[PDB]
Design a binder for this molecule. Sequence first.
Ligand SMILES: [Zn+2]
Ligand SMILES: [Zn+2]
Ligand SMILES: [Zn+2]
Lengths: 319, 52, 133, 224, 136
Amino acid sequence: DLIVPRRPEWNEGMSKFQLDRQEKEAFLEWRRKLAHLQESNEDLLLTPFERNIEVWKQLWRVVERSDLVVQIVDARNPLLFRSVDLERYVKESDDRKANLLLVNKADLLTKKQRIAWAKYFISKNISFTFYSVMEKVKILSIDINIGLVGYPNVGKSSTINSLVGAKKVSVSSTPGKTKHFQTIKLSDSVMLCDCPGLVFPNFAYNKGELVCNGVLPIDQLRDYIGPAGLVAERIPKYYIEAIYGIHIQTKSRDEGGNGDIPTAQELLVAYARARGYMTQGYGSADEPRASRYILKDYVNGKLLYVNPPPHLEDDTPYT
Amino acid sequence: IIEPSLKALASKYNCDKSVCRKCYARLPPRATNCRKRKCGHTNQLRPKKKLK
Amino acid sequence: TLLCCNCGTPIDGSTGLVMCYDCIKLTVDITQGIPREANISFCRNCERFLQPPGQWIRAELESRELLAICLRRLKGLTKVRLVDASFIWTEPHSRRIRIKLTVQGEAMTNTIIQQTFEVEYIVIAMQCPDCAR
Amino acid sequence: MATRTQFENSNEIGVFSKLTNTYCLVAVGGSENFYSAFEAELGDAIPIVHTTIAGTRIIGRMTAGNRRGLLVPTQTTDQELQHLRNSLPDSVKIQRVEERLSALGNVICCNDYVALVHPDIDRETEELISDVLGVEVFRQTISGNILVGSYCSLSNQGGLVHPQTSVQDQEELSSLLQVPLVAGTVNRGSSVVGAGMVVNDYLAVTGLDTTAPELSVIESIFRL
Amino acid sequence: SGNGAQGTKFRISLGLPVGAIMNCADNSGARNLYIIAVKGSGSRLNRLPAASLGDMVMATVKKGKPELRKKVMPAIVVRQAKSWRRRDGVFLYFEDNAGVIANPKGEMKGSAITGPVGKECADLWPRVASNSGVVV
RNA sequence: GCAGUCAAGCGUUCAUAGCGACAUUGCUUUUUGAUUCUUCGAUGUCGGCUCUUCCUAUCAUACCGAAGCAGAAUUCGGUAAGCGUUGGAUUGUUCACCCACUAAUAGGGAACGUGAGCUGGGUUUAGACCGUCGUGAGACAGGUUAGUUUUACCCUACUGAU
RNA sequence: CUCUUAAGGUAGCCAAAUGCCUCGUCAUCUAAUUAGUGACGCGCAUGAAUGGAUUAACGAGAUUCCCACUGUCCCUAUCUA
Ligand SMILES: [Zn+2]
Ligand SMILES: [Zn+2]
Ligand SMILES: [Zn+2]
């Protein structure tokens, strides 16, 4: 119901140590609000958030002076990327405001399925754009500070190139790099405030997650089985067979233990055997190593998949 | 069932004694001077523990 | 169609199960052998805490390597398939850290049960010896 | 009555002993109180015979007997067979079987008037069993556990199975046998119910660890 | 040694030492067991401990049901290939070394034993005899 | 490194069951150091493997005593060194850390035992590569790789043999 | 804006044959790994023909893991010249 606190009452004063005390007290209340959710929503379904205070204290220096912000979000699943409490947040101070949020990274989708998402907004009165009322298919970059903000890794450090395009800040494979906020100035009328790294918590689709598609590092993951299972659920096997060129199984376990569309334990037992990566002590498939190379290809763009917006649909994406 | 007329007797030979703080040797309760030579015939004794 | 064999009354399932949920909650325990309160050391200047022998891990308060150190500490949690190790909120000025743990302990014969239990971590001030116009 | 004892320190009485309406069998490990679970419960009603077939003490899971016959594996010797023929009546027909399995009491769940047999038993023993015991057979399953005589105890008046038994299978075996039964564990949550006990019309025997809520269902289901 | 052993055994020819990788008969999903240790098994310099039939071992699965592997578990060996001697004279052997998963109290995890079983194990471990279908 | 003496206190009360500060007395040469007597017309120099023997400041085993010893389990102490004191991953390792069994997985010495007994992973010649330093030749107790391990037939000792 | 007389490590890469602290941290492999692999990088002291990065094939090159194999080992025995 709430995802961002309030940042009121600047008033152009003094007491450098106290204007951060008041922020600390807005944070103690925010932390208290986060804590009571665990007793409310069962007592196991937690949330992805930044425990550190300095990271949000950094985010609080880069919007009130930004005065106009845009919200990068990938076109893979905006549903868990849409920020819930920005509209309730930057409207009150009666100054330069009104983000008019966006969705982006819209080059990994077919054309008939882009109106399939454009029509999710013709009903509910929401702002948007398609940049990687019907007089619109797709227009490139042609379409006072400002700001850009993203979940983590949505292209905040790759759409710095929308202004000058020379890679003035490093783009990485890991999401955990951007921090200690950066600022970029050009054209002598407009300014930027490139944000630090973010996440944002959530309560729906909490533990049963396909959220690990762009949010978390793939390397230091001790589970390796949940997201791999939800990967194996989708993307029928008669495409992964033809792409990778390997004959895994025929699913002899036709009873009530596995069923069809095999889970992520019989799919990977013959793949590390085809690629020879074997354990340190016995010759057997190392699924905890083989899952990572497949998930990295899943995330980088070798395997594609997009999500139906509002409701129960069996197979919306057609590859 | 020990009938404490007799519990007194068993305690004369078991729990009415005095022990050296330096060799942990059963000595009589009236005596000083631990009879064993390795202690040096010392005088540091104590009663044996009977209550808690 | 069975009966509990301990409480008696309940007719439990046929998936493969054991004595009734109340008895396995009360009598059967699978979290024994852990100190509920765990002591750690800390300095206010160097700010480098340690496991009792160890180089300073250098992590900050309320961080992710606190899980690594707290699990590395000698308890029974390392032995039984941990999962869901989050950090429960605590007062900053109480100087104690609160973390819940879940272990997947096997019941009487090949029947798993979920467990909800908790460990509290108290920290004591130290001068951090190596450290000592 | 469920007279609880341990053989030596093991609560698995259907391993070491066997008991039916004409006799009882026991192993050689002493612990006279264990014998005092029948010598105290029986007068001179029926005998108790002390044997070690094949050098084994595990009478119950090797042998398979009834009121009018005892089935005994191939490995057993004439001298462990001779005392077994003498110190029993002439009623019971003893017969060394010459089949492939050996643990007959882990494949057979026999009472006086029905039986159940492991699926892949020899089709010659399929008829030897009815010629020596006079009983019918139905060689299907228990709950998928091919080992039927270890996961099901039987009297003529009652039955018992493990707790994984599907309620469909329970009523199935009921429709087979015209006996009740319950998904009742034994010896404080054991699944080897055929071995954790040995039952008769008026006598039940478990382990010392076997608990009163198990005695409760046992005396219910077996006595009547 | 007597961690679940009902009786007490004779010495049998110590077949398979540690490092051995013997089949698993039980219906617990496993396929092989890597022996890492033996209960009993006194010490001598450079001697690695060994396991006979009926002995308990402590073991490590290499193939089957990742729920099981990457952890030690007790086990019970029930067939071995080393010709061993019975007091009745004859030297017998099996065609494969094979074992069972078990708990420290001598009980089992599985419901059956896919194959023949040795009398020198089954007399001793009684919970194995109730789950065995064949003995020698 | 080990031990002892006072004993302010801890020890629910209870200095000393156990521990025990402020001070103070010593032992040891399995640490490191100081020194520089011997050896520079050479005493073959890390570790491991193998093998024997010895010491006790005993980890276990035997008989005993004492406890804040009900039992069970533990700790303190004594006579005692007769008997035993492991398999393995990583590391060249000494050292260390973990898995595991076990009654126990105690410490140590014998030219920091043992290279005409082995090995030669390391270090310590020469070839070569990187980093930093230096103008440079070249340096590094920094990292990496490759790199000849000789002889006993004598005397004694020992094992056996006339 | 400046300071040192010039500039102020761009692209790229990494505890790498270059990283003292260091058995760095996280994940993985293992029952257990100072090893190995991937990733992180204020990097004692990486870095662009004092060439950087990637690279199919090749290698009596250095290294780790696996299948097979076996007296390498458990633990020794025997045979021939
Ligand atoms: Zn004295
Ligand atoms: Zn109950
Ligand atoms: Zn400090």
